[PDB]
A and B are shown apart, each in its own frame.
With several copies, the nearest count.
Chain A
Amino acid sequence: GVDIRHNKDRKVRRKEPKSQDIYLRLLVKLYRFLARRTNSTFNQVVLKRLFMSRTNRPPLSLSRMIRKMKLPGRENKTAVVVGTVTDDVRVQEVPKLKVCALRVTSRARSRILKAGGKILTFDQLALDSPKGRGTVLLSGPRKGREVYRHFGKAPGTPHSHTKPYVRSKGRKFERARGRRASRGYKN
C-alpha cells in the first residue's frame, strides 16, 4: 500500500461563498475572472475576502479608516474594505475619503458625502482599477468580537485572563472560592 497518513489530506478552506445572495455571487463571478486572468494578488485576496463569513470579515469603522488612511504616504489612494464601513460617532471632522465596500451604513454614507468623499461598490472598483492598483486594502478588527474573551487558557488556571461564562455579573456569581485568597485558594 502507501504509508501516507490521510488526516490533513483535505484542505478546509472555502471555494464558494456560503451565502445564497445573488449580488455577492455576481461579485464572485467577476472577481473569479479577475484573479484568474490578472497577475495582481489584490484580486486573489479580495475574492478570498468576498468568500468569507461575516464573523471573519468584521465591520471596519470609519475611525480606523481615517487613521489608517492618514498614515503618511497614502494620500489620494482608495481604501478598500470587504466588510461594512460603519460610522464612528466619536470623530468630528472627516477628510476626503475614496472608499470601496460591500455595504456602507447610512450615516457613514451621509458623513463621507458631506465631507466630499465618494463611495464605490466592487463592480465600480473593478472598472476603476482592474489590477487593483492605487488601493489600500484594510480589514476590520477580527478579534474585536466579545466572544474571544472567553477563549484561550481557561479561568481557574494561573495567569489566565479569560472572561468566564456566568449568568449575571454580581457579588455572588463566582467571586468566592477560586478568586479569593481567604476563601480557599487564589489560582
Chain B
Amino acid sequence: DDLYGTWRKAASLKSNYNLPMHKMLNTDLSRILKSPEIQRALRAPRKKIHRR
C-alpha cells in the first residue's frame, strides 16, 4: 500500500498514482438478482413453452 496506494491514500513512493476505480462494485450478481429490491419490481415470468 506504500507502492500502489490505498483507495483513499495516494501512492507514497510513486509520484502521481492511485488505484483504478471500479466499474461496478457489488460483483456477486446473484445477490443482486434474488434481492427484494428487484424481485419486487419485475413482471411475472412467462416460461410456458408454446411449440408449433
Of B18, B21, B40, most buried by chain A (CB within 10 Å of CB) is: B21
Q: Are A103 and B21 in contact (CB under 8 A)?
A: yes
Q: Are A33 and B33 in contact (CB under 8 A)?
A: yes
Q: Report B22-38 residues with CB < 8 Å from chain A CB.
A: 22-27, 29, 32-33, 35, 37-38
Residues in B whose Cβ lies below 8 Å from that of A127: 26, 32, 35, 37-38
Task: Give the nearest-CB partner of B25 in chain A.
Answer: A121
The tally of CB-CB contacts under 8 A between chains A and B is: 58
Is the C-beta of B51 less than 8 angstroms from some C-beta in chain A? no
Task: Give the nearest-CB partner of A131 in chain B.
Answer: B41
Is the C-beta of A27 less than 8 angstroms from some C-beta in chain B? yes
Q: Are A30 and B33 in contact (CB under 8 A)?
A: yes
Q: Are A37 and B23 in contact (CB under 8 A)?
A: no
Residues in B whose Cβ lies below 8 Å from that of A27: 23-24
Task: Give the nearest-CB partner of A127 in chain B.
Answer: B37
| Chain B 36-49 interface 0/1 with A at a Cβ cutoff of 8 Å (1 = within) | 01101111010000
Is the C-beta of A99 less than 8 angstroms from some C-beta in chain B? no
Task: Give the nearest-CB partner of A128 in chain B.
Answer: B37
Q: Which B residues lie at the A interface, using CB under 8 A?
A: 18, 21-27, 29, 32-33, 35, 37-38, 40-43, 45
Q: Which A residues lie at the B interface, using CB under 8 A?
A: 21, 23-24, 26-27, 29-30, 33-34, 37-39, 102-104, 106, 109, 121-124, 126-128, 130-131
